[PDB]
Design a protein around this nucleic acid. Structure first.
Lengths: 122, 125, 122, 125
DNA sequence: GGATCCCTAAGCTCCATCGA
DNA sequence: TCGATGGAGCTTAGGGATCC
DNA sequence: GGATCCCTAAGCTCCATCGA
DNA sequence: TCGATGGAGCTTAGGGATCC
């Protein structure tokens, strides 16, 4: 919450029109935490922060995001913020599947994209 | 607020993936009341409900939108809900200007788009 | 709606503390249209009115009522009002099952209870 | 109204089948704010939320309840929600009277029942 | 630390002003 | 400074403080 | 007929009075 | 009697009227 704000910041710097969503869960429809675009690229974002790794994500959590992202016309991304470390971005494709869910461990965080890679990637 | 809710639904019903911008202005940036995409069409929407025409809009409010829309990659629209009428969507280009603000009056309102025509304005072509 | 009021009336006459429910469907939980009791007997009621017969009821409609009735500690009843005719009461047990739903036709209405039978029945 | 909603849930969570009386008074009769049953226990509930004790109740309001409760076949209770405290259930018999009204004050409040104790007051015995 | 919560600031439609 | 009675506003939301 | 809708009346907690 | 601008209330609900 105190994070989203400055992530939007990081985001406006990268040349992204960012916005937050007013009441994520609310309606029977899915919702990301942030939706940002820049003309060529669109992004649905699940915003996460943790003291340490790994980051866990229920299949249903990811399911929702991808559904919105897909149906809206944007890219499923998870923003992970670790203490004093800068935001890394993980496309759902990149998430480690588990026995039945998802996660990001030491062996995955490395691949995350700094916000800039994400933009100039297209 | 009752209709940001209402409209929002109408959009989903219309195959659009819509969202209410967290604080139509609480954010430290220019913001729309609603943002909707659907794969081909993207909307920066300013949501208004009046009891009767005209509807005046601050030139501020407008640049605010166009700037955002021009920047996000969306078409800037004004959605206007009039009593016992359906929602009406107006591209900003359609807004007639007063001395130094804008307006939708009885001359413009009729030309607003139902939501379908908005999504299906993409198929032209 | 204009009916419930006077049915409550019919009900207060029969010596029933009746009440209406504020927003039937509302919550994820089931709701009758009226809940009335008199010390010995309790009643969950689906209030229906029709110009003519038969009365149709989805399995899910009845399902809800019975669930509330059962879990509350009352009796599943359907109040049927026909034009100029007095209210008849049908316990769910009494409803005609169809291919997959429920209903009340000419051959069933007859069995309905006038509000008084329902009270002094216990 | 926010808490009639709230409480109502707490009851369901507590295995009670509860309902909000359509118009806590709009009906042409004496009515409770809430009615809940669960097969063994039946509640005629007057719902109040104060910011701090005491809570005064019109002797009217009370007979209204007892009469209904005595008539429906339910135990008449007052549910009182105090800030940052859980709901508290008070049988009418527990209400101390002022000169010609009633009250729950700092002497009574402590003795209110959590909801469980209400449902489990049935098992005594 | 976490949750509740209290409260202050702002936001939206309407009304009336002000003006035409 | 409480103790009980008789009279008016009613939004949404984000932050600091507070109880626990 | 049906739906929306506009609007007026009432309801609840709080505050201040009034009183102690 | 409109035409555009600058300033305040904000509840819930049931019924008559109104548009369609």
């Amino acid at each position: 919450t105190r994070f989203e704000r400055d992530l939007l910041v990081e985001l406006w710097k990268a040349g992204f029109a960012a916005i937050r969503v007013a009441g994520s869960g609310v309606s029977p429809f899915p919702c990301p935490d942030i939706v940002a675009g820049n003309g060529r690229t669109y992004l649905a974002i699940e915003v996460k922060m943790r003291k340490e790794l790994p980051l866990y994500l229920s299949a249903d959590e990811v399911e929702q995001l991808v559904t919105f992202a897909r149906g809206f016309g944007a890219e499923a991304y998870v923003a992970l913020k670790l203490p004093r470390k800068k935001w890394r971005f993980f496309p759902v494709q990149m998430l480690e599947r588990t026995e039945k869910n998802f996660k990001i461990d030491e062996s995955v965080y490395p691949l995350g994209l700094e916000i800039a890679e994400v933009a100039g990637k297209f």
